[PDB]
Amino acid sequence: SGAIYVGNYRVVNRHLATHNDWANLVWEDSSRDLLVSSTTAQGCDTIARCDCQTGVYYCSSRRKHYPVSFSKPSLIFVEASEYYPARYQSHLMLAVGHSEPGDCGGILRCQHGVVGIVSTGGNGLVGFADVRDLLWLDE
Ligand SMILES: COc1ccc(C#N)cc1NC(=O)N1CCC[C@H](C(N)=O)C1
Numbered sequence: 001s002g003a004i005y006v007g008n009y010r011v012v013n014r015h016l017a018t019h020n021d022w023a024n025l026v027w028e029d030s031s032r033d034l035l036v037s038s039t040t041a042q043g044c045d046t047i048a049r050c051d052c053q054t055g056v057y058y059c060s061s062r063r064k065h066y067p068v069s070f071s072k073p074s075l076i077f078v079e080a081s082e083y084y085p086a087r088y089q090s091h092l093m094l095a096v097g098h099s100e101p102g103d104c105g106g107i108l109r110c111q112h113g114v115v116g117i118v119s120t121g122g123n124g125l126v127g128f129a130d131v132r133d134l135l136w137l138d139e
């Protein structure tokens, strides 16, 4: 679990979105595993606007933050799950690191701010859904 709070927006994994997220829907993209809903309270997270390939992520299954090198956002094949059939997920970045399904939503940050959230994993790899291209989150 986990979300990014920026301005009047809440960013979450689309597969973990609540009834409230869907009733206050702004945008969602199944191919990116993202959903953005509106909030009544103002968010203070800073979104990074960069091409950083190093950062730190929070791993709830270990109660620890880990430093990682990660790939550039791209289309990566993702195994079928209870939420999606087998498919390419876009805007995904992989790193060598620990993750379990409940780790989705953990923030990945660089010196510039929030880069994305945990979205996939398996076999000692962790995947992050990028949010740096969503320029509208700031306005
Ligand atoms: C952090 O996720 C994991 C980590 C480890 C393992 C293990 N065994 C499995 C996962 N789950 C995972 O990758 N999923 C399930 C939820 C939807 C995700 C998606 N974006 O399509 C794909």
Ligand SMILES: [Zn+2]
Pocket (backbone or CB within 6 Å): 048, 049, 050, 051, 052, 110, 111, 112, 113
């Ligand atoms: Zn950066």
